[PDB]
Swiss-Prot record, chain E:
Changing residue 27 to K: In strain: Omicron/BA.1, Omicron/BA.2, Omicron/BA.2.12.1, Omicron/BA.2.75, Omicron/BA.4, Omicron/BA.5, Omicron/BQ.1.1, Omicron/XBB.1.5, Omicron/EG.5.1. It comes from Severe acute respiratory syndrome coronavirus 2 (2019-nCoV). Residues 7-49 form a coiled coil. This is Spike protein S2'. Subunit of the fusion protein that is processed upon entry into the host cell. Mediates fusion of the virion and cellular membranes by functioning as a class I viral fusion protein. Contains a viral fusion peptide that is unmasked after S2 cleavage. This cleavage can occur at the cell membrane by host TMPRSS2 or during endocytosis by host CSTL. In either case, this triggers an extensive and irreversible conformational change that leads to fusion of the viral envelope with the cellular cytoplasmic membrane, releasing viral genomic RNA into the host cell cytoplasm. The chain holds residues 943 to 991 of 1273 of the full protein. Changing residue 39 to F: In strain: Omicron/BA.1. Changing residue 40 to A: In strain: Alpha/B.1.1.7. It comes from the Viruses.
Length: 420, 384, 211, 148, 49
């Protein structure tokens, strides 16, 4: 079939109709970003000429090919640790949550570390870790930061966020009640803080339900972890191809260097070993080039993850769709195998109504414009209300400002501006 | 480190310099203990050879083949081996040996070789282009010459039993037309049960030790252990993904031996700058502290660094959370890296902290913008 | 009379032990789900061409089929490999034996060796003058046709007879239907289990899914 | 050591050129690394084989060098884009993005030239001295909730 | 010339494909660039080389 681009939705546009949400929903989205890859290291001399003095002596005729491949792989390995350090070590102190979890109805026990585990990882972190999973000179170097240290860094970031807002990312951590922090964030998205202080219980319930649905999605969908597992698969395939390349002849009488050595005298043993050396050296160079190209991509992804951490966890972002669909409120970092997972908490308007709007209002020949928000009419009466939430108020001289006269603004309407 | 860096000054850090490799202690040679001698006598000292059109193909099996006497014998006019070297025939050994005995004219000897063509290499005897074996020829003008008209000439290894059949007359007064007794030794080197092996004495086998083994010509180095892999009765060798041998069957005792490569790993040298000290700490990567102030880490075996309980900021990274540094009398120490000072936040539901002051801070960020605009004349570089 | 070969005709290609690995090999195998000429042994032994190799299978209840003949003329004019299994002895000869017009058993020799309810499968092929026999004995409970299932065949005999083979024939003990296939240089993907037994195979040219 | 990656790029480029130059001394299987020596000693039928070996080796070395240079040029291009973005959004304006312009609240930046690079002096506002206070989400005056 | 890098990418890809195609006419030391010509003139022992 021809694929569908989505359901068609005509927008009821007109020159004096506005739609304002009357309700909202708190939605938590998940974004997975690779941070690092496996720190492989290949002994080029042992791979090409494993335990063969004649082959090593012949390989010495190729100059510094072996050493430069080793150098490139070492650079990649160091860059991996640099990526991990850049993404996670963005907090100068190891904060920890207070023993009493009085966060005004917000339940963070789902993403805070669980003390009962042998490794203090959250339940979501355990879900992430349980979903994502030779003798030829090919070795794997262990990462500098252990999973326990990554978990400690993420716990520090999460505790600092929950207890201090963006103040810990800016400078010294400044404690603040979580309800007040959420009021800060609501003011950050153009919604008055009275909305939060009046719908605190509803918002807390929505946040908890969203976190539970994150549990359900992570426990039910294996394909949720995407590019992160794709990197692992690509690296495994690259190593498998490099290993399988050892069985090729490349034109030589045998793929076994010992077999070639035990059957031929040096005068043509050298020719056979030259063919094998050329083939295996080409294979190593191909592997190293692929690894460099993929390491550049992983470095770019790590820079993106560090940017998201700084501008989304340590602060609040005004950039659209940088921190999930909707108006960003806050994000929570979580550790993943060779990656980081962000839980973007966003504000999404839900239920709208049609209103008649007006650019300005005449009271005494003077044009009144809203200080904040827009003018709406329920059919008979005119109110001024904020943009992202329907909360009508009487139009007063404290809500509007005077500019010009009635004869300039197109679409101005007549009403009365109450004077306190 | 100094040689690896091609410099006389070593900067602070950890460098990968060499590779640790356990060495074998003794060599194991193992062949079936068959005392039979291969009947090369009835092939090379036969009274009469067959003609080139119906050359006899003799099977040689279940015997010991001594090629040294054949090589050293001076009766041979030419001895050309194409698959294997003549001096390796005593160590290498084969499943089966084919000896094709026939008589060829003096000028046609060059045609008995892989890749050769002509009225002999194509019509009455063709050798494969991948032939593995030796061609042996000696003059027989004092045994076969007369006129001797009993010798006639007409796919590889094909016996093709105005006629396309012609004969020549052998006379002592005819070099390039004199009779040559040429015999082709054909070997098969497929990994299979070996029946023809050279006069090399076998030795006792040593298990659980890094040894240089030799099983029916299959050579290598590794540690031999008893394995629980069920070889089928026709199976002789086991293989891994990389085509290397993984398990073997002892030809003398029908038991299976597992071959594991002897311990190896990279060697990393943890040193402060030579401007500071000449003392170094050595890390043996991904090996145990057995085959090597010894500290065992998940990154390998660390020797020369004293383990310290106190944690500091990472100075020289090692791996798996261990970092090393030069600290006080001074020496190299090993410790777990510290992620920073712990700072509990005095959180409560009605307490807020507001800064009563501020400080202006100026930071520096350096960003590369460009690199050197090099250009290489490829023609001049390659072929100046 | 024809029938379906299903997944029969899979044998160990070499003498190298492998375990828990998918290995691809290029060797003369029986095509999956091919047609194998079906003969009856009721109340029928032509001389069949050998081609490039033969798959032979039979279902037995009283040990009626006990021998095979290989050759070109089968009339004492050329060396003919002969196999007979009488009582409890396996007998193999390569003599230029003189054969009858309808050879069957009642109820320059250069080599010689002397040692429904049952399904016996055999594979015969000559490479470079080497005569190899692969076989597998397994119990079955079926009389209508060859049972459906997978079971690998191991080699038991390797003879360097060096005979040019083009035709063959089966020996019947007269006082068990048998099936004959043919091998082609087909590509197979063999699944070796933990114990090294070929449990599954994929016929790379059978269909696009197997591709 | 204050200037890091900037000097690292120079070191990498110099090392790549040094390796490319040193590759001219290798044999790659030829009798001599000197093309003039090979030419002055052999007739064309064998000089062709020796020169073929040398050509293969040197051409493959050039290809390796060029591939490394392309990979590094991509990284330098990304860094230059980052520098241009920082200039535009940090020097030519004021940035609200956290830690994009130094730790703290960004006030202004000053550009400085560096060898094959740019140096930014990010001036940021950092709160220093704190005090504990008792806070309240709202205040009742006459039954009505007042918010700041 | 208003459309810059967008047309530059197309040009680079076209040049890469043209170079790849033209590489088929090179000898690389062989007697002929035509594989059929090499096959029809030589027996396997050096046809393989
Ligand atoms: C805004 O939407 C929420 C839905 O999330 C409404 O809350 C629901 O209210 C009904 C009663 O009317 C309850 O049965 C549900 O359990 C509530 N849901 C949740 C998640 O708490 C809320 O009433 C809506 N507000 C307005 C003004 O329409
Ligand atoms: C936050 O939610 C968690 C659920 O993930 C609550 O933990 C559960 O608490 C109930 C008690 O009512 C126990 O029966 C469950 O076994 C708990 N589940 C787990 C996974 O521990 C937790 O109580 C909630 N927090 C608050 C303050 O209510
Ligand atoms: C538009 O809003 C006004 C103000 O709320 C509504 O007028 C009030 O309507 C309620 C009925 O629920 C009465 O109890 C009040 O006495 C009315 N007050 C005034 C000042 O009029 C009006 O009904 C709304 N009209 C529409 C069409 O929604
Ligand atoms: C809003 O009110 C003003 C009067 O306050 C209206 O102005 C009238 O416009 C008509 C048509 O131009 C004139 O005939 C009247 O004389 C005007 N009134 C006065 C007092 O001068 C204006 O039309 C009203 N606008 C709307 C949209 O109703
Ligand atoms: C950091 C340090 O100690 N650097 C020293 C330097 O002071 C001294 O002048 C020089 C002479 O060899 O050696 C180096
Ligand atoms: C019984 C029989 O047919 N024997 C033949 C013999 O006649 C023939 O001369 C020889 C050829 O080498 O092969 C054998
Ligand atoms: C038990 C046994 O050996 N049976 C027969 C034997 O009588 C016969 O002489 C031989 C001929 O090949 O075949 C077999
Ligand atoms: C506003 O009016 C349009 C007119 O078609 C209607 O489709 C739309 O649903 C209305 N808005 C709401 C929130 O119902
Ligand atoms: C809005 O559009 C309507 C036509 O649907 C028109 O009658 C009316 O005058 C317009 N009002 C303004 C302010 O443009
Ligand atoms: C053949 O006989 C000679 C002596 O006549 C002997 O030296 C030689 O070794 C014999 N050939 C072989 C293969 O032993
Ligand atoms: C080797 O000698 C042993 C006796 O020590 C014997 O059992 C074994 O069969 C011999 N090997 C062969 C291949 O005959
Ligand atoms: C080293 O060997 C000992 C046994 O002597 C064992 O207990 C330990 O786990 C081994 N450690 C490593 C890293 O191999
Ligand atoms: C660390 O302290 C514990 C107990 O105080 C002791 O057993 C251990 O040996 C110490 N570690 C080192 C490296 O001294
Ligand atoms: C096998 O024979 C049947 C007839 O019974 C026929 O329909 C089918 O096409 C044949 N298949 C092959 C592969 O010959
Ligand atoms: C392998 O053989 C053993 C016999 O000891 C048996 O217990 C086991 O189940 C077999 N495994 C497989 C995968 O066939
Ligand atoms: C606020 O009170 C806590 C309670 O322990 C204390 O640690 C903290 O230092 C106080 N704040 C300041 C700025 O002193």
């Amino acid at each position: 079939y021809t694929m569908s681009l989505g359901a068609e939705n005509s927008v009821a546009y007109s020159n004096n109709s506005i739609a304002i949400p009357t309700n909202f929903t708190i939605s938590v989205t998940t974004e997975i970003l690779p941070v690092s890859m496996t720190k492989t290291s290949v002994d080029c001399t042992m791979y090409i000429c494993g335990d063969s003095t004649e082959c090593s002596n012949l390989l010495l005729q190729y100059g510094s090919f072996c050493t430069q491949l080793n150098r490139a792989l070492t650079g990649i390995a160091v860059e991996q640790d640099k990526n991990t350090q850049e993404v996670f070590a963005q907090v100068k102190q190891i904060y920890k949550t207070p023993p009493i979890k009085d966060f005004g109805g917000f339940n963070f026990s789902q993403i805070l570390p669980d003390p009962s585990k042998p490794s203090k990882r959250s339940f979501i972190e355990d879900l992430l870790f349980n979903k994502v999973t030779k003798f030829n000179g090919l070795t794997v170097l262990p990462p500098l930061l252990t999973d326990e240290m990554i978990a400690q860094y993420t716990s520090a970031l999460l505790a600092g966020t929950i207890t201090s807002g963006w103040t810990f990312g800016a400078g010294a951590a400044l404690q603040i009640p979580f309800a007040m922090q959420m009021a800060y964030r609501f003011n950050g998205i153009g919604v008055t803080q009275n909305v939060l202080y009046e719908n605190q219980k509803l918002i807390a319930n929505q946040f908890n339900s969203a976190i539970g649905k994150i549990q359900d999605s992570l426990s039910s969908t294996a394909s949720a972890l995407g590019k992160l597992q794709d990197v692992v698969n690509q690296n495994a395939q690259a190593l498998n191809t490099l290993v399988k390349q050892l069985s090729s002849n490349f034109g030589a009488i045998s793929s076994v260097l010992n077999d070639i050595l035990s059957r031929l005298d040096p005068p043509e043993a050298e020719v056979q070993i030259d063919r094998l050396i050329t083939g295996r050296l080409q294979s190593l160079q191909t592997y190293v080039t692929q690894q460099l190209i993929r390491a550049a991509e992983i470095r770019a992804s790590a820079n993106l993850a560090a940017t998201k951490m700084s501008e989304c966890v340590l602060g609040q972002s005004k950039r659209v769709d940088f921190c999930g669909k909707g108006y960003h409120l806050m994000s929570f970092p979580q550790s993943a195998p060779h990656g980081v997972v962000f839980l973007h908490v966003t504000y999404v308007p839900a239920q709208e109504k049609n209103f008649t709007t007006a650019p300005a209002i005449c009271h005494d020949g003077k044009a009144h414009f809203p200080r904040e928000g827009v003018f709406v009419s329920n059919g008979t009466h005119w109110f001024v209300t904020q943009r992202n939430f329907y909360e009508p108020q009487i139009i007063t001289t404290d809500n509007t400002f005077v500019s010009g006269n009635c004869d300039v603004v197109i679409g101005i309407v007549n009403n009365t501006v109450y004077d306190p | 480190t100094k040689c690896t860096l091609k410099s006389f000054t070593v900067e602070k850090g950890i460098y990968q310099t060499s590779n640790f490799r356990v060495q074998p202690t003794e060599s194991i040679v193992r062949f079936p203990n068959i005392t039979n001698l291969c009947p090369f006598g009835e092939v090379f000292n036969a009274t009469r050879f067959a003609s080139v059109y119906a050359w006899n193909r003799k099977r040689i099996s279940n015997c010991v083949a001594d090629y040294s006497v054949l090589y050293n014998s001076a009766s041979f006019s030419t001895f050309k081996c194409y698959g294997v070297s003549p001096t390796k025939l005593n160590d290498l050994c084969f499943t089966n040996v084919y000896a094709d005995s026939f008589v060829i004219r003096g000028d046609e000897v060059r045609q008995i070789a892989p890749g050769q063509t002509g009225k002999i290499a194509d019509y009455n005897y063709k050798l494969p282009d991948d032939f593995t074996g030796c061609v042996i020829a000696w003059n027989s003008n004092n045994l076969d010459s007369k006129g001797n008209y009993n010798y006639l000439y007409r796919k590889p290894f094909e016996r093709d039993i105005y006629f396309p059949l012609q004969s020549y007359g052998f006379q002592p007064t005819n070099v390039g037309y004199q009779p040559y007794r040429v015999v082709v030794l054909s070997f098969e080197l497929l990994h299979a049960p070996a029946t023809v092996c050279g006069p090399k004495k076998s030795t006792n086998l040593v298990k659980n030790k890094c040894v240089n083994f030799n099983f029916n010509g299959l050579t290598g180095t590794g540690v031999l252990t008893e394995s629980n892999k069920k070889f089928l009765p026709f199976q002789q060798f086991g293989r891994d993904i990389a085509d290397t041998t993984d398990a073997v069957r002892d030809p003398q005792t029908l038991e299976i031996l597992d071959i594991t490569p002897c311990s190896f790993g990279g060697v990393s040298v943890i040193t402060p700058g030579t401007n500071t000290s000449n003392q170094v700490a050595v890390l043996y990567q991904d090996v145990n502290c057995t085959e090597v102030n010894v500290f065992q880490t998940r990154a390998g075996c660390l020797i020369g660094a004293e383990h310290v309980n106190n944690s500091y900021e990472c100075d020289i990274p090692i791996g798996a959370g261990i970092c090393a540094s030069y600290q006080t009398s001074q020496s190299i120490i090993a410790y777990t890296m510290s992620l920073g000072a712990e700072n509990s936040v005095a959180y409560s539901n009605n307490s807020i902290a507001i800064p009563t002051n501020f400080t202006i801070s100026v930071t520096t960020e350096i960003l590369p913008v460009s690199m050197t605009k090099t250009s290489v004349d490829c023609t001049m570089y390659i072929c100046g | 009379a024809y029938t379906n070969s299903f997944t029969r005709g899979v044998y160990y290609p070499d003498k190298v032990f492998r375990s828990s690995v998918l290995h691809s090999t290029q060797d003369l195998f029986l095509p999956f789900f091919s047609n194998v000429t079906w003969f009856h042994a009721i109340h029928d032994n032509p001389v069949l061409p050998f081609n490039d190799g033969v798959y032979f299978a039979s279902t037995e209840k009283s040990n009626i089929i006990r021998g095979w003949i290989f050759g070109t003329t089968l009339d004492s004019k050329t060396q003919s490999l002969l196999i007979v299994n009488n009582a409890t002895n396996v007998v193999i000869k390569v003599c230029e034996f003189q054969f009858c017009n309808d050879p069957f058993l009642g109820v320059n020799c250069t080599f010689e060796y002397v040692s429904f309810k049952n399904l016996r499968e055999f594979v015969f092929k000559n490479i470079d003058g080497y005569f190899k026999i692969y076989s597998k004995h397994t119990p079955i409970n079926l009389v209508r046709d060859l049972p459906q299932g997978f079971s690998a065949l191991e080699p038991l005999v390797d003879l360097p007879i060096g005979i040019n083979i083009t035709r063959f024939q089966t020996l019947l003990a007269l006082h068990a239907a048998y099936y004959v296939g043919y091998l082609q240089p087909r590509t197979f993907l063999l699944k070796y289990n933990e114990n090294g037994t070929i449990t599954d195979a994929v016929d790379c040219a059978l269909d696009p899914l197997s591709e």
